[PDB]
Structures are given as structure tokens and as C-alpha cells.
């Protein structure tokens, strides 16, 4: 039962113009089986457009490749990002590259360690902000988590569900 291809693809920006389908493949095959690997080129000149994409056989292989950043490919540090799987209707096909999530539906009994214990397995956490009422100090039932890197957030928002402290949470990219 293969994972959807869109969830196995990595857009690679910042390519050296000398990178080819073949050299990009030789690099990224170190972290998994590549079912697809293509450098974007101009249709007339064949000059590289400076980016491309690779598709792994599994999501765990995508994880392995992201955990092996920074990637220096043909002498240049590149910028891999997971494919846009849920677009912003106003900015079709654009990656919203942020390090912060909104976490809603945690009610008043969810504390910092609940969120840390869960989200630390997606990435390195820098800030956890449990929101409280400006007048009363009561918890408002949502929080923001800031990570040191965008891929944590990308992994988080492509999941269908997040269960934290027994709550079914709503999670989205923030700011
Ligand atoms: C707007 C935006 O960044 N959407 C995304 C990103 C990923 C990995 N899935 N969906």
C-alpha cells in the first residue's frame, strides 16, 4: 500500500547549473530508492533552471534525506523542501516555509510538557507558548510551537491527525 507520491517528493532548490539528472540521482540515492529524479531545464537552451525534484520510494526515505541536510550537491549547498501537498488557495503551488505551528483544541488541562513530549519527535523545539487570557490568565486552549527548522512543521502539517493529552488537535502553519 504505497504512500501517495506527493508525500514522497522533495523539491531541490539552489542547484548548481552543472547538476544533471544523473548527478542529482547519485547524490540522493544515498538515502533511499529514487523512483524519480529530474533537473528542470529551459525548453530551448537546455540550461538548468537551478532546481529539480527527487521522489523516494517511501516517506521514511524522505525523512532520512532531510535528516542528512545540509546537502552539498556538485559543490553547492542546496535547499530541499517537501512538496506542497496542501496549497494556500491564494498562492497556488507556493511553499509556506515557516518554523512555527498553531496547535488548537488543547483546552485548559494541556501543559508545556504534553506538547514538548509529543512535538519533540518531529524536530528541535525552541519555543512553546501556551496562550492565556490577557485579563484573567486562564488558558485559552491553544498554543504555538516554534522549531529550529521548517521540515518539522512540514512533517507535522501533512499528518491527518494529532493527539496530544488525549485531545484531537487542530494544527496549522503559523505566521
Ligand atoms: C502552503 C504549504 O506550504 N503547503 C504544504 C507544504 C507541505 C509539505 N504540504 N503542504
Curated annotation (Swiss-Prot):
Location within or outside the cell: Nucleus; Cytoplasm
Region (Globular B domain): 89-175
Residue ranges constituting the RRM domain according to the UniProt record: 8-91, 99-175
GO molecular function, one term: DNA binding
Modified residue annotations for Phosphoserine: 16
Alphabetical UniProt keywords: Acetylation, Amyotrophic lateral sclerosis, Cytoplasm, Disease variant, Host-virus interaction, Isopeptide bond, Methylation, mRNA processing, mRNA splicing, mRNA transport, Neurodegeneration, Nucleus, Phosphoprotein, Repeat, Ribonucleoprotein, RNA-binding, Spliceosome, Transport, Ubl conjugation
Single biological process term from Gene Ontology: mRNA splicing, via spliceosome
Cross-link (Glycyl lysine isopeptide (Lys-Gly) (interchain with G-Cter in SUMO)), chain numbering: 107
Modifications after synthesis and translation: Sumoylated.
Record flagged with keyword Acetylation: yes
Superkingdom of the organism of origin: Eukaryota
Chain segments carrying region Globular A domain: 1-88
Protein task: Involved in the packaging of pre-mRNA into hnRNP particles, transport of poly(A) mRNA from the nucleus to the cytoplasm and modulation of splice site selection. Plays a role in the splicing of pyruvate kinase PKM by binding repressively to sequences flanking PKM exon 9, inhibiting exon 9 inclusion and resulting in exon 10 inclusion and production of the PKM M2 isoform. Binds to the IRES and thereby inhibits the translation of the apoptosis protease activating factor APAF1. May bind to specific miRNA hairpins.
Disease field: Inclusion body myopathy with early-onset Paget disease with or without frontotemporal dementia 3: An autosomal dominant disease characterized by disabling muscle weakness clinically resembling to limb girdle muscular dystrophy, osteolytic bone lesions consistent with Paget disease, and premature frontotemporal dementia. Clinical features show incomplete penetrance. Amyotrophic lateral sclerosis 20: A neurodegenerative disorder affecting upper motor neurons in the brain and lower motor neurons in the brain stem and spinal cord, resulting in fatal paralysis. Sensory abnormalities are absent. The pathologic hallmarks of the disease include pallor of the corticospinal tract due to loss of motor neurons, presence of ubiquitin-positive inclusions within surviving motor neurons, and deposition of pathologic aggregates. The etiology of amyotrophic lateral sclerosis is likely to be multifactorial, involving both genetic and environmental factors.
Subunit structure: Identified in the spliceosome C complex. Identified in a IGF2BP1-dependent mRNP granule complex containing untranslated mRNAs. Interacts with SEPT6. Interacts with C9orf72. Interacts with KHDRBS1. Interacts with UBQLN2. Interacts with PPIA/CYPA. Interacts (via the RGG-box) with the HOXB-AS3 peptide; the interaction inhibits binding of HNRNPA1 to the intronic sequences flanking exon 9 of the PKM gene, preventing inclusion of exon 9 and promoting inclusion of exon 10 which suppresses formation of the PKM M2 isoform and promotes production of the M1 isoform.
Record protein name field: Heterogeneous nuclear ribonucleoprotein A1
Organism annotation: Homo sapiens
Lineage: Eukaryota, Metazoa, Chordata, Craniata, Vertebrata
Portion of the full-length sequence here: 7 to 181 of 372
Amino acid at each position: 500500500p504505497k504512500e501517495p507520491e506527493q508525500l514522497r517528493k522533495l523539491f531541490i532548490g539552489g542547484l548548481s547549473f552543472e547538476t544533471t539528472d544523473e548527478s542529482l540521482r547519485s547524490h540522493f540515492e544515498q538515502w533511499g530508492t529514487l523512483t524519480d529524479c529530474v533537473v528542470m531545464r529551459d525548453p530551448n537552451t537546455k540550461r538548468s533552471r537551478g532546481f529539480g525534484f527527487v521522489t523516494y520510494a517511501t516517506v521514511e526515505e524522505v525523512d532520512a534525506a532531510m535528516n542528512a541536510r545540509p546537502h552539498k550537491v556538485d559543490g553547492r549547498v542546496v535547499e530541499p523542501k517537501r512538496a506542497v501537498s496542501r496549497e494556500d488557495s491564494q498562492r497556488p503551488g507556493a511553499h509556506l516555509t515557516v518554523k512555527k505551528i498553531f496547535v488548537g483544541g488543547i483546552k485548559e488541562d494541556t501543559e508545556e510538557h504534553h506538547l514538548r513530549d509529543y512535538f519533540e519527535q518531529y524536530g528541535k523545539i525552541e519555543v512553546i507558548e501556551i496562550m492565556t487570557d490577557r485579563g484573567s490568565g486562564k488558558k485559552r486552549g491553544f498554543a504555538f510551537v516554534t522549531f529550529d527548522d521548517h521540515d518539522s512543521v512540514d512533517k507535522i502539517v501533512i499528518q491527518k491527525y494529532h493527539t496530544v493529552n488525549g485531545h484531537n488537535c487542530e494544527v496549522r502553519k503559523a505566521l
